[PDB]
């Protein structure tokens, strides 16, 4: 009956920068609560009744709103504030989509590594090819699998770590899953990596044998 739409979905904020995220309702409401959830942990009450700060919430956190537009404000962004914030209220049937607030840092292009399937895995009927993208920022990246220059689709699964504690970067591993018969049919396997820190795509490849 009352839909909550948060904006924006993802936020990159440097240390000390001002941070403002918004939560809009499809109809008028009296108040709005905000919840904090970090990866692996349960959500916590953070700002209730529009502007009341829950216990332990730093003074740099601010709540405000009226009618259909509510907001959460951080006057000086700190690295401990990196989390996902959800807005909600009894009047709404479910939570907002959330706003993932990440720590902003300098651009670091990914380091690309390729790994052929092991010999003992080839002894079965499966050949996994793994492409590693190590310590890059921002998150946005594109990994293409090329085997004999044929563009692959629907046969690769990706996994991305959370933002690193020390250097605030991301890591990504893409696994190409192909049978042993299809693997030895072709010769050259490659992953093509594109990222805003790379003016030219980085390609890592190998040949069987």
């Amino acid at each position: 009956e009352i839909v909550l739409t948060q904006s924006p979905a993802i936020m990159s904020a440097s240390p000390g920068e001002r941070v403002t995220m918004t939560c809009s309702a499809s109809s008028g409401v009296n108040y709005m609560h905000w919840y904090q959830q970090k990866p692996g942990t349960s959500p916590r009450r953070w700002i209730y009744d529009t502007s009341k700060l829950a216990s332990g919430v730093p003074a740099r956190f601010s709540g405000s709103g009226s009618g259909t537009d509510y907001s959460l404000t951080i006057s000086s962004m700190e690295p401990e504030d990196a989390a996902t914030y959800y807005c909600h209220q009894r009047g709404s049937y479910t939570f907002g989509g959330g706003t993932k607030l990440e720590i902003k840092r300098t651009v670091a292009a990914p380091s690309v590594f390729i790994f052929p399937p092991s010999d003992e895995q080839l002894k079965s009927g499966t050949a996994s090819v793994v492409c590693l993208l190590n310590n890059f920022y921002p998150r946005e990246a594109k990994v293409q699998w090329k085997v004999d220059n044929a563009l692959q689709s629907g046969n690769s699964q990706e996994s991305v770590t959370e933002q690193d504690s020390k250097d605030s970067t991301y890591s990504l591993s893409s696994t190409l899953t192909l049978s042993k018969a299809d693997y030895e049919k072709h010769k050259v396997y490659a992953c093509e990596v594109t990222h805003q820190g790379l003016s030219s795509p980085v390609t890592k490849s190998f040949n069987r044998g």
Binding site: N30, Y31, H33, Y35, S42, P43, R44, R45, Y48, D49, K52, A54, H88, R90
Partner: peptide, 19 residues
């Protein structure tokens, strides 16, 4: 997750389980 609703209700879900 289970979460306890506050009383009065407009103080939000104050305690959450670990899920």
């Amino acid at each position: 997750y289970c979460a306890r609703g506050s009383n009065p209700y407009y103080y939000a879900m104050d305690y959450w389980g670990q899920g």
